[PDB]
């Protein structure tokens, strides 16, 4: 039973992920050529999103903040892992018990869906099964950990969790917010994945404070991600994965070299041109650093460039991946803020270009200063046309994502789906076990975000029920009322947050609070989105938690403490673009 002991869920993720790609793609093709199908895809997409979690525990690849986990000894590192499993097991069991009761009640009173007509107890079997699988995978890893740690450690880990959860039941009533934030910080600091840290924080408040009936959690979990716009996350992630691993990044890098290889520092100008070209393919920063940093960094060092400068320019140059569409943070914002994704995408183009121009100019200045130079080659119209022809598959995707959205032809999630379908086609017919493994990786990666959004929706709901967005809004207005003085305060706050928190985690936590106040003083909701994303993209390359630095440092085996100094000038040039977009809303929103 080894195949079921390890790879039980993976076949379903592969089967489901392919389905929603085909279902949504077929829905789109017939729609354009010229309705119940969306209901089916949304039900399946919920199935893979929660089935894929059990995998993410056995791989132990859950996204989390490990700023102090790394600092802790090995012994304390193990204790942190047993605590994470217990905490994540408390959440998994609770959503299991409520999910069963919810199904039992739904059986008593049947209730069918609009289009499919399925009883609602059928599509909700994801909650009991998936949190049923999740709970066992936790039990396996917990069993393995206790073998690794021992009897003394295990009781230390368990007793610590007992004291952690004791106050919730000891006291009949405790204030909602202190418990909500107090626990969210603890789980975040200890090492629990952010998505889970939110869920347990919300779950703890419901218990002690009774903000919502406990039965709401399961219903919120399924309903919070029952929307079509959110489906653009897995589609874009799949499209990037099937193409990032392809090796077309080398074809772009050759094209970027052709354009900008002649100028002094032309190599570092080629790197930035590549990341910008690959920014219109991948919707992530670290996907861009890894997909390009793997190639350019060893090449730059060999040509003579300092490795640290090669690591720096690649980290910052890759942050453009989230600016130029596609990009996850915009999709996370468009869903969490209920803003227009078709407008956020076009919003970030101009800030993305300005950041690239800013870096290219600085690179030109640095190279000319240090005497660095590019390669020698007789590039001409013949060679340029040859390079364009080679990267054609890479350059075809931006047409689909932009033409579909900007042109008003397709919804953002429809255009995302066509991209993944295209990624598969070029992911096999231009390059089975590897293809099977990639599909698991895309679904595993998407589920890392959707589960975060579901747990955030429960979190955001408890905050709204406590009028937190107004409590913050009144304090800010009273302190100052000027729109400019306000946008400065937000932009600073996000900068401090970006050095400590993940981009997507911060977006979902903060958008529920910041969105109203900035709207009161007349900031466009979309404009605040571009500010938020651009302000968090700079968070990729800001220590200690550099979401892009870590990838580049690994590809170069550098030292972050030393790589941080090299990239500091690059941060400043990005902050210049940040202020320009914030306080000159005309140009960043030229299209949007």
């Amino acid at each position: 039973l080894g195949w079921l002991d390890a790879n039980f869920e993976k076949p379903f993720l592969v089967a489901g992920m392919l389905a929603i790609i085909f279902i949504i793609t077929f829905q789109t093709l017939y729609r354009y050529i010229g309705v119940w199908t969306e209901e089916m895809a949304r039900f399946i997409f919920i199935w893979i999103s929660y089935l894929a979690v059990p995998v993410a525990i056995k791989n132990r690849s859950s996204i989390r903040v490990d700023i102090i986990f790394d600092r802790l000894p090995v012994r304390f590192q193990n204790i942190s892992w047993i605590i994470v499993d217990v905490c994540f097991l408390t959440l998994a069991a609770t959503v299991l018990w409520q999910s069963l009761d919810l199904i039992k009640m739904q059986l008593t009173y049947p209730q069918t869906s609009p289009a499919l007509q399925l009883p609602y107890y059928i599509p909700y079997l994801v909650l009991p099964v998936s949190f049923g699988l999740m709970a066992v995978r936790l039990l396996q890893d917990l069993a393995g950990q206790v073998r690794i740690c021992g009897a003394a450690d295990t009781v230390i880990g368990l007793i610590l969790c007992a004291v952690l959860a004791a106050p919730l039941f000891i006291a009949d009533y405790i204030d909602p917010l202190p418990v909500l934030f107090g626990y969210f910080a603890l789980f975040l600091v200890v090492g629990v994945p952010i998505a889970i840290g939110l869920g347990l924080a919300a779950l703890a408040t419901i218990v002690a404070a009774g903000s919502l009936p406990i039965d709401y959690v399961a219903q919120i979990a399924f309903t919070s991600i029952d929307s079509f716009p959110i489906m653009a996350i897995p589609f874009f992630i799949a499209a990037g994965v099937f193409m990032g691993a392809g090796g077309l990044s080398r074809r772009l890098l050759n094209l970027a070299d052709e354009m900008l290889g002649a100028l002094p520092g032309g190599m570092a100008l080629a790197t930035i041109g590549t990341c910008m070209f690959f920014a219109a393919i991948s919707g992530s920063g670290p996907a861009t650093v890894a997909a390009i940093g793997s190639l350019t960094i060893p090449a730059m060092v060999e040509r003579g460039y300092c490795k640290y400068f090669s690591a720096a320019i690649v980290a910052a140059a890759g942050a453009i991946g989230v600016m130029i569409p596609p990009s996850n943070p915009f999709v996370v914002y468009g869903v969490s803020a209920q803003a227009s994704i078709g407008k956020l995408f076009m919003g970030g183009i101009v800030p993305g270009l300005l950041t690239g121009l800013a870096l290219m100019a600085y690179s030109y200045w640095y190279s000319k200063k240090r005497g660095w130079k590019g390669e020698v080659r007789d590039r001409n119209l013949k060679t340029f046309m040859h390079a364009v022809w080679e990267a054609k598959w890479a350059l075809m995707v931006p047409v689909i994502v932009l033409g579909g959205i900007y042109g008003g032809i397709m919804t953002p999630t429809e255009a995302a789906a066509l991209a993944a379908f295209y990624g598969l086609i070029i992911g096999c017919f231009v390059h089975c076990g590897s293809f099977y493994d990639c599909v698991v990786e895309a679904a595993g990666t998407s589920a890392m975000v959707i589960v975060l959004m579901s747990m955030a929706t429960i979190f955001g709901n408890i905050m709204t029920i406590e009028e937190v967005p107004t409590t913050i809004a009144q304090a800010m207005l009273g302190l100052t009322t000027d729109k400019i003085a306000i946008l400065l305060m937000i932009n600073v706050l996000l900068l401090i947050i970006g050095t400590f928190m993940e981009a997507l985690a911060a977006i979902v936590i903060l958008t529920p609070i910041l969105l109203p106040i900035v709207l009161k003083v007349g900031v466009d909701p979309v404009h605040f989105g571009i500010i938020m994303v651009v302000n968090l993209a700079i968070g990729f390359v800001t220590p200690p938690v550099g979401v892009n630095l870590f990838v580049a440092s690994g590809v170069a085996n550098a030292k972050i403490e030393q790589l941080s100094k090299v990239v500091l000038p690059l941060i400043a040039l990005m902050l210049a673009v940040l202020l320009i977009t914030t306080y000159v809303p005309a140009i960043p929103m030229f299209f949007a």
């Epitope: 739904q106 209730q111 609602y120 219903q219 929706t457 709901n461 809004a473 529920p512």
Partner: nanobody
Framework: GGSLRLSCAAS????????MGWYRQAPGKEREFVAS???????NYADSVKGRFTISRDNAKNTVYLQMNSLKQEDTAVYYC????????????????????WGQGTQVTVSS
């Protein structure tokens, strides 16, 4: 056929509504759905209203506007200004429900 350019303003201790919308209850008919605008300015219209009525808002004054246009005798109903929160207030058997707060309404009569 001119435009009545309906405007509705909410008064209360609230800071700002997450959602706002319009419902029209024609005589001898049901309180149907006209239009709705999200906090981030996602506008959802009823099928008949698609492209005819534009809904906007002024977050500073806390006012929702329904720039009714190209009105016809097929549309002569009273109009109710509805506003509800960001998240559903109650859940029951795996569905989410909104508790809409309602305005008195303003007869919108159209002839020829």
């Amino acid at each position: 056929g001119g435009s009545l350019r309906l405007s509705c303003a909410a008064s209360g201790n609230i800071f700002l509504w997450a959602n706002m919308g319009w419902y029209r209850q024609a005589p001898g008919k049901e309180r149907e759905f006209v239009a709705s605008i999200s906090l981030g300015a996602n506008t959802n219209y009823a099928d008949s209203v698609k492209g005819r009525f534009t809904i906007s808002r002024d977050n500073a004054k806390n006012t929702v506007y329904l720039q009714m246009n190209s009105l016809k005798q097929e549309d002569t109903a009273v109009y109710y200004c509805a506003v509800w929160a960001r998240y559903p207030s109650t859940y029951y058997l795996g569905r989410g429900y909104d508790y809409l707060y309602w305005g008195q309404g303003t007869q919108v009569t159209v002839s020829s």
